[PDB]
């Protein structure tokens, strides 16, 4: 135990991917432990080289009446730019060009290196997408989150119930929702992920150094960069909560429920006409838990013979959605 | 974005001279246009205040200037005319805290 | 020095509306804060040339 | 370049600032992105800095400000974040000087 903290291929893994009697690939294929994520969103190249510029408007007064001679002083409107950057992420890729062939068909390999990493490249790109920064930037999206008003723009994005505590760790995520068209923005080449392509050069070794370099190998790397883009804020819609434990009273009772998403959905248009569609975020948990508290309010409700409800994935009847946020932002609405 | 120039942590420290660090933004030049960077977050206590500088790899003239108050987030802007060397932040002073970031230019905007 | 709430349009909108990468316009367009209202109303002309009279 | 706003001068006598005039440069905005500038010709005798404010149509809150010494001719640049009254420039302070103050707006530069 002197030193050393190594990475790269070794005959260690490739040997334990492989299968006894033959086979050619691997038995098809390699399963399971890691969340799966939408977004699924779109694209948008465009301005300036960096930034976005964008603009809205400032204030829009005032008009006066005409007492048939009196008019005097004309009016003008103005505006603002805004805008924020991206950012992006790649590491690379090798094997050693050899055991690639040991035993033969190193594309299945290099194959399930692709869906493998791509998979935890998009976890990454859901995690931190919706999460901001004080850091070494993309991008930004948390910091339209503290409440009430005059201090920054919220309202219609902090609608919002409060509770839990600020000054201890639990538990209380948040559910969103907010409109596309509202894009997400990349530097004018190509875009997220596109890899693809291939390298054959020579190493470049380990630590120290490894004792001298030059082999021959496969390498190559998938590139992707981005950052989200406000365009028109309107469409956002945020909430605090809960922390789970005040939707168990409301298990099936009225008292402090969920229904103040109907409040959100009609704090939003305007309009502000746009863009198409719309859908609604969870973090799998507070999906479920709305399901089992909406089943049973004690209100409205018919469901014949029997529940527990068609799913739900309506309301009304716009698509929901699930994501993998934190289940812990502390309370955070206001300190 | 982005590596050339700097990082945290510089760190300031408890409460120092804030020359760090080394390599590097090199002299020879002049500039008048585009822009810089410099904020952080994390602070315990007091006043602060930066600053700048240059000549010939070591000493030791001209500044602009900046100020700050106690708050946990902030960032102002840019410089103008320069000599060419640049080094600085040079921040100080009063009291203590630990672990205050920094991390100076270039590119990055809010909003 | 300068002493008036500026009317008319100073160069500080020109540079936020600006031009950059080009261009003509604002990407169809600027948007934003103002409320809607409706009215959206029936309009018409009335006897004579103003008041409308009618009794009740 | 231009009208509304600034215009020279003040002129910056012995002893005063000069905080006046300009009522207004409206009250309500934010500003982060384009340039600004001021200078003027003639001084006397050491040192002088500027300054800016803002509020609500009158006074008063944070501010930015300067600091420079005794020459003819110089310029710094911009600003960051501010709500809207801009009652600067508030200069300073001391010696016997009496002439010429600045106004702003775009460049600029030398040749």
Known sequence: ?335 | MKTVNMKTGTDSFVGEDGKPETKDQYPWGLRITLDNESLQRLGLNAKSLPAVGDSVSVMAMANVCSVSTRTTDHGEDNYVELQITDIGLAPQKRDDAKELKDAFYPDGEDD
């Open chain 1, 1 to 335: 135990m002197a030193l050393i903290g190594q990475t790269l291929p070794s005959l260690l893994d490739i040997y334990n991917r492989t299968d006894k009697n033959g086979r050619i690939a691997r038995i098809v294929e390699q399963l399971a432990k890691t969340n799966d994520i939408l977004t699924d969103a779109i694209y948008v190249p465009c301005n300036d080289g960096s930034k976005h510029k964008t603009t809205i408007r400032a204030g829009i007064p005032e008009p006066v009446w005409r007492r048939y001679n009196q008019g005097v002083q004309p009016t003008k409107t103005q505006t603002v730019p805004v805008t924020d950057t991206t950012g992006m992420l790649y590491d690379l890729g090798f094997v050693d060009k050899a055991l690639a062939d040991r035993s033969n068909n190193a594309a299945a390999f290099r194959v399930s290196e692709n869906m493998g990493k791509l998979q935890g490249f998009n976890n990454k790109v859901a995690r931190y997408s919706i999460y901001g920064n004080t850091d070494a930037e993309p991008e930004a999206f948390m910091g339209l989150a503290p409440r009430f008003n005059t201090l920054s723009t919220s309202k219609a994005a902090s609608a919002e119930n409060v509770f839990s505590a600020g000054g201890s760790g639990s538990t209380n995520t948040s559910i969103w929702f907010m409109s596309w068209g509202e894009n997400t923005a990349h530097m004018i080449y190509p875009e997220g992920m596109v890899a693809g392509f291939q390298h054959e050069d020579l190493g470049d070794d380990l630590v120290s150094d490894g004792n001298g370099g030059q082999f021959r190998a496969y390498r190559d790397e998938f590139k992707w960069d981005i950052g989200l883009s406000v365009r028109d804020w309107r469409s956002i819609s945020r909430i605090c909560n809960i922390d789970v434990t005040t939707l168990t009273k409301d298990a099936s009772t009225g008292a402090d429920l969920i229904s103040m998403m109907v409040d959100a959905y009609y704090a939003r248009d305007v309009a502000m006409l746009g863009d198409g569609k719309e859908v609604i975020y969870a973090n799998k948990t507070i999906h479920a838990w709305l399901h089992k508290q909406a089943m049973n309010a004690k209100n409205v409700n018919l469901t014949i013979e029997e529940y527990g409800g068609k799913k739900i994935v309506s309301f009304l009847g716009i698509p929901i959605r699930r994501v993998d946020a934190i289940l812990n932002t502390e309370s955070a609405v206001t300190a």
